[PDB]
Amino acid sequence: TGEEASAQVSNRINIVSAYGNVXXXXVDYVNLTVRQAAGADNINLXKS
Amino acid sequence: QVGIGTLIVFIAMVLVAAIAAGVLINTAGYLQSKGSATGEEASAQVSNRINIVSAYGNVXXXXVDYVNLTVRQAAGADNINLXKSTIQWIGPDXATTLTYXXXXXXXENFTTXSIKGXXXXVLVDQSDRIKVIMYAXXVXXXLXXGXEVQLTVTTQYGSKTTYWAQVPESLKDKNAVXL
Amino acid sequence: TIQWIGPDXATTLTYXXXXXXXXXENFTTXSIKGXXXXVLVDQSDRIK
Ligand SMILES: *[C@@H]1O[C@H](CO)[C@@H](O[C@@H]2O[C@H](C(=O)O)[C@@H](O[C@@H]3O[C@@H](C(=O)O)[C@@H](O[C@@H]4O[C@H](C(=O)O)[C@@H](O)[C@H](O)[C@H]4OS(=O)(=O)O)[C@H](OS(=O)(=O)O)[C@H]3O)[C@H](O)[C@H]2O)[C@H](O)[C@H]1O
Ligand SMILES: *[C@@H]1O[C@H](CO)[C@@H](O[C@@H]2O[C@H](C(=O)O)[C@@H](O[C@@H]3O[C@@H](C(=O)O)[C@@H](O[C@@H]4O[C@H](C(=O)O)[C@@H](O)[C@H](O)[C@H]4OS(=O)(=O)O)[C@H](OS(=O)(=O)O)[C@H]3O)[C@H](O)[C@H]2O)[C@H](O)[C@H]1O
Numbered sequence: 001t002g003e004e005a006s007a008q009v010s011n012r013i014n015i016v017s018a019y020g021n022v023x024x025x026x027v028d029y030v031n032l033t034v035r036q037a038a039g040a041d042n043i044n045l046x047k048s
Numbered sequence: 049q050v051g052i053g054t055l056i057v058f059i060a061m062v063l064v065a066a067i068a069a070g071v072l073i074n075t076a077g078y079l080q081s082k083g084s085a086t087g088e089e090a091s092a093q094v095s096n097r098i099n100i101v102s103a104y105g106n107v108x109x110x111x112v113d114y115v116n117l118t119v120r121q122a123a124g125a126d127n128i129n130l131x132k133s134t135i136q137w138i139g140p141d142x143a144t145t146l147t148y149x150x151x152x153x154x155x156e157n158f159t160t161x162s163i164k165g166x167x168x169x170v171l172v173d174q175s176d177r178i179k180v181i182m183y184a185x186x187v188x189x190x191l192x193x194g195x196e197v198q199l200t201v202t203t204q205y206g207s208k209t210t211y212w213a214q215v216p217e218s219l220k221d222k223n224a225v226x227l
Numbered sequence: 228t229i230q231w232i233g234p235d236x237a238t239t240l241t242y243x244x245x246x247x248x249x250x251x252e253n254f255t256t257x258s259i260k261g262x263x264x265x266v267l268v269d270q271s272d273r274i275k
Binding site for chain 1: 052056059060062063066
Binding site for chain 3: 004047
């Protein structure tokens with residue numbers, strides 16, 4: 001319990017910026033650039 | 049315990065302060081770029097201007113059928129492109145807004161010719177004069193003796209220069225006049 | 228069991244079989260992450 005609780009609080013994703021392609025007159029994609037927060041461990045982006 | 053409880057909360061508080069410090073600096077980042085751009089463009093609006101040196105036109109039969117303007121850089125202005133610029137024509141008949149027609153005689157458009165300089169559309173230097181060419185019988189009817197025209201040469205940045213072109217009282221025995 | 232202290236009623240909702248749009252005073256669970264759609268196995272499971 002002690003290990004998992006600290007992992008819950010600390011392991012976090014930080015979003016740097018967001019951009020998307022635009023065709024004709026409508027945004028057809030939404031892309032984000034993410035990074036792990038301060039002191040975080042390995043963050044798998046499939047179980048997320 | 050209180051020792052265990054304190055450490056977990058302390059971990060959260062530095063993260064919260066990190067987020068709080070994050071928004072403050074980044075918001076200042078956007079305001080920096082927006083502020084700097086506003087200062088430059090506003091300064092360019094006041095400074096970059098056009099001065100009309102003199103105006104003249106051809107005389108056929110008994111009607112001034114061209115209006116030619118000799119423009120020059122204003123005091124302290126930067127490059128003045130004459131294609132992205134526009135000129136208003138409040139004549140005795142029509143009241144339209146002319147634009148650049150690349151190469152012409154020009155219907156409802158104006159042309160340049162470069163009196164002096166290394167460009168025929170840009171006022172790069174301070175000593176370079178460009179001739180703005182305007183067709184009278186194309187934008188409207190051929191000007192008659194007395195018909196005054198009001199012209200405002202609007203630069204891209206927004207600065208305006210107004211010149212009132214007044215055809216001489218009598219057009220007898222003269223091939224060209226000074227409007 | 229889920230207790231619904233709402234603005235009008237106040238009941239205790241129990242689970243019902245896969246019956247959406249007809250779920251009266253019951254609640255239904257549709258899986259979001261995982262193989263099981265009624266039980267949370269590991270930390271990565273998410274159920275709606
Ligand atoms: C969010 O981020 C995603 C990241 O993928 C991004 O998605 C891409 O957007 C591209 C564009 O719309 O910006 C798409 O580009 C097209 O497909 C590429 C590829 O095939 O996937 C490239 O394809 C070649 O294009 C040439 C060209 O002459 O058109 C064609 O001969 C042929 O379709 C392809 O030939 S190839 O290169 O020999 O394979 C090309 O883009 S490029 O690689 O940047 O030059 C585009 O045709 C891309 O498919 C898409 O996944 C979103 O846009 C973001 O919002
Ligand atoms: C305002 O500024 C504009 C700037 O364009 C100016 O426009 C010009 O005005 C000239 C004149 O009316 O002052 C026009 O001149 C005529 O056309 C020229 C050219 O063809 O465009 C020249 O034409 C030749 O002249 C010979 C000559 O012996 O007279 C003739 O054989 C024949 O007309 C033409 O033969 S050619 O060259 O083989 O084609 C001539 O003017 S010139 O070049 O100055 O000597 C005139 O005939 C000119 O067309 C027009 O753009 C306005 O006048 C200003 O008010």
